[PDB]
Amino acid sequence: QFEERHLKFLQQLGKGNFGSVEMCRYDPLQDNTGEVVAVKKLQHSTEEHLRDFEREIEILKSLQHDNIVKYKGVCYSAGRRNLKLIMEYLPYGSLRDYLQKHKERIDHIKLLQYTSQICKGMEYLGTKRYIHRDLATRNILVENENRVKIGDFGLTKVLPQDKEYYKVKEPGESPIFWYAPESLTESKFSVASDVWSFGVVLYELFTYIEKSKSPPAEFMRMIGNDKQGQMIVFHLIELLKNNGRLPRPDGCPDEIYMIMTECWNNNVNQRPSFRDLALRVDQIRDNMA
Numbered sequence: 420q421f422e423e424r425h426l427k428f429l430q431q432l433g434k435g436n437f438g439s440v441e442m443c444r445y446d447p448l449q450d451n452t453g454e455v456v457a458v459k460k461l462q463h464s465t466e467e468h469l470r471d472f473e474r475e476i477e478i479l480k481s482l483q484h485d486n487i488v489k490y491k492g493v494c495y496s497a498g499r500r501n502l503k504l505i506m507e508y509l510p511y512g513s514l515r516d517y518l519q520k521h522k523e524r525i526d527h528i529k530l531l532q533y534t535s536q537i538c539k540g541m542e543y544l545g546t547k548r549y550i551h552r553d554l555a556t557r558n559i560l561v562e563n564e565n566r567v568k569i570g571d572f573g574l575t576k577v578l579p580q581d582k583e584y585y586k587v588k589e590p591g592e593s594p595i596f597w598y599a600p601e602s603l604t605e606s607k608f609s610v611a612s613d614v615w616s617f618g619v620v621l622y623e624l625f626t627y628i629e630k631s632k633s634p635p636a637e638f639m640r641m642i643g644n645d646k647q648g649q650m651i652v653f654h655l656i657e658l659l660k661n662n663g664r665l666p667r668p669d670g671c672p673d674e675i676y677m678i679m680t681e682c683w684n685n686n687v688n689q690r691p692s693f694r695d696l697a698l699r700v701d702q703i704r705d706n707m708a
């Protein structure tokens with residue numbers, strides 16, 4: 420529905436490996452009444468990346484949830500590539516940056532509100548047999564002080580009809596300090612591996628994104644900063660097989676650290692569901708209030 424003639428560039432919000440996101444104003448009447456949107460595009464539009472980009476557009480079109488960023492449409496230039504995905508724009512940016520800028524005004528009860536919203540959005544993803552694979556405070560976006568949203572679906576894959584996991588080894592470097600053990604060793608991605616990663620999201624939240632308490636900082640202080648390249652991954656695998664874990668964040672109540680550890684269970688069938696986590700986090704929140 421969108422025409423690239425009338426999309427007008429304001430600034431770049433983010434740029435990763437295969438894609439980038441720009442703030443733009445859709446102003447079809449050329450009079451500065453149009454609305455400001457977010458536009459995602461590929462920056463190396465190979466054909467494999469393009470077909471995966473279109474499955475992502477189709478996945479995001481199939482989702483409507485208060486905690487999922489809103490799809491708006493697509494746009495094409497002359498031809499049926501240079502394809503662009505149009506989404507709503509959220510003014511407060513990533514939850515990672517929002518939280519370390521207001522760390523002295525956001526208490527634990529507010530952290531738990533975000534947490535339960537993330538859970539409800541993740542639970543909605545699971546009902547449609549989507550695996551996010553990429554959850555982190557980096558990709559959680561902020562609509563306003565009371566609402567967060569899951570903000571990017573570049574790696575979201577749909578489960579096969581028969582099986583409850585997905586095997587993918589990607590070319591390039593992966594965020595291996597959020598990945599469940601069975602994802603490091605066998606590249607299996609399930610809703611239980613997303614629960615592992617939600618545990619480290621919750622860890623991040625309670626570290627208030629303090630620089631020396633990032634999961635990579637803490638993990639690679641546990642295995643030694645001397646480790647080399649591929650050996651890095653191997654050493655982390657061994658540390659997770661011996662029940663080495665991230666430490667409890669400073670000030671974190673023991674109840675919330677028990678939720679974190681229960682998601683970091685080595686036994687994949689023994690991790691809690693997102694609906695159970697939402698109920699645990701809603702009761703901790705209701706007792707604090």
Ligand SMILES: Cc1cnc(Nc2ccc(OCCN3CCCC3)cc2)nc1Nc1cccc(S(=O)(=O)NC(C)(C)C)c1
Pocket residue numbers: 430431432433434435436438439440457488506507508509510511512513557558559560570571573
């Ligand atoms: C879909 C969408 C809607 N609204 C926003 N709002 C937003 C608003 C301000 C942001 O500030 C970024 C920090 N500075 C960068 C320059 C301006 C400010 C960042 C994001 N972002 C959105 N997506 C987005 C924006 C930046 C990064 C990401 S991502 O890290 O999760 N994924 C990739 C873009 C790398 C694929 C996703």
